[PDB]
Write a structure and sequence with these properties.
The structure is a homodimer. The first copy, chain A, is of the alpha+beta class. The first copy, chain A, is 30% helix and 20% strand. The first copy, chain A, has a single domain (12-189), classed as 2-Layer Sandwich (60s Ribosomal Protein L30, Chain: A). Chain A: Belongs to the MotB family.
């Protein structure tokens, strides 16, 4: 039951973990763990309303997080992505996106994180081309260091922060045309 | 049409705004921004234009992401410090991005892209059409995922 003299202690970890279950009433999850080649782990596939994003931790592609040297053991992961892309129509555009953390670049040839990220995304794009993706469906982008995923306090988080993302989308304009036709017809301005 | 004349220079350079279903594209001709099509030296004359674009950006919904896209015609580069169309297009986009940052656009909302000589706006069949392909395009979008979340919830409840 209870002591006859009840003296509550300070709020503790029991009370933290009980209230540490708070979350959104409508908890939807638009990410799934992805498996490249039945052996390529830590990747995720995310859906957003304008497209799909395949997120690849640094270590699935590059020999390190401050280099654009593709780890040759990982060439087969890029081949698998190329194969799947070749199963999409030529309508689909593929944007390879590079990201870095805040690691100092003085020991490398890179002068900026934007530059490092650009070279990483470019190299991945070029390997996709080697494996047959039409260059007319590809582009590369750099975000530099300012879109982190997690604090940079573990190897796993560092690999996420230095990820490459592959974004799949189209340039559909049917709704835009519809509005344009209506606007031209009805707006005096 | 989904393309409309965008008045920037007011000198008939050819700037245009296009709407597509997942965002907006401001298209800026080479001559507007750059000293030539073979390099990334911005026209100091036109810093005014990028500044204007930076001001307008800070009026948009806070969820907006801005991607500055670089493109080239498919003519050889044989003369300069640039070793590929991808590299030249990346540098041109980078420079426009950096000016936007200089005029107050948050770096967290900015990225730059290169398409090299792919995805031409006009066939590379005439001198003037080639030059059109040296434009920069600024794409405005968001990473909205409400619909995606809706579907995931329904799928989780009814599929598994």
């Amino acid at each position: 039951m209870q002591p006859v003299v009840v003296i509550p202690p300070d709020s503790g970890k029991e009370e933290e973990q009980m209230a540490s279950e708070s979350s959104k009433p409508a908890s939807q999850n638009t990410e799934t763990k992805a498996t490249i080649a039945r052996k390529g782990e830590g990747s995720v596939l995310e859906q957003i309303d304008q497209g799909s994003i395949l997120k690849l931790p640094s270590n699935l592609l590059f020999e390190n997080a401050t280099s654009d040297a593709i780890n040759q053991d990982m060439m087969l992961y890029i081949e698998r992505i190329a194969k799947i892309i070749q199963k999409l129509p030529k309508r689909v555009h593929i944007n390879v996106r590079g990201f870095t953390d805040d690691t100092p670049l003085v020991k490398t040839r890179f002068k900026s994180h934007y530059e490092l990220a650009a070279n990483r995304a470019y190299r991945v794009m070029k390997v996709l081309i080697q494996y047959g993706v039409n260059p007319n469906q590809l582009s590369f982008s750099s975000y530099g260091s300012t879109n982190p995923i997690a604090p940079n306090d573990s190897l796993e988080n560092r690999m996420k922060n230095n990820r490459v993302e592959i974004f799949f989308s189209t340039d559909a304009n049917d709704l835009s045309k519809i509005h344009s036709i209506l606007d031209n017809e009805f707006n005096p301005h």
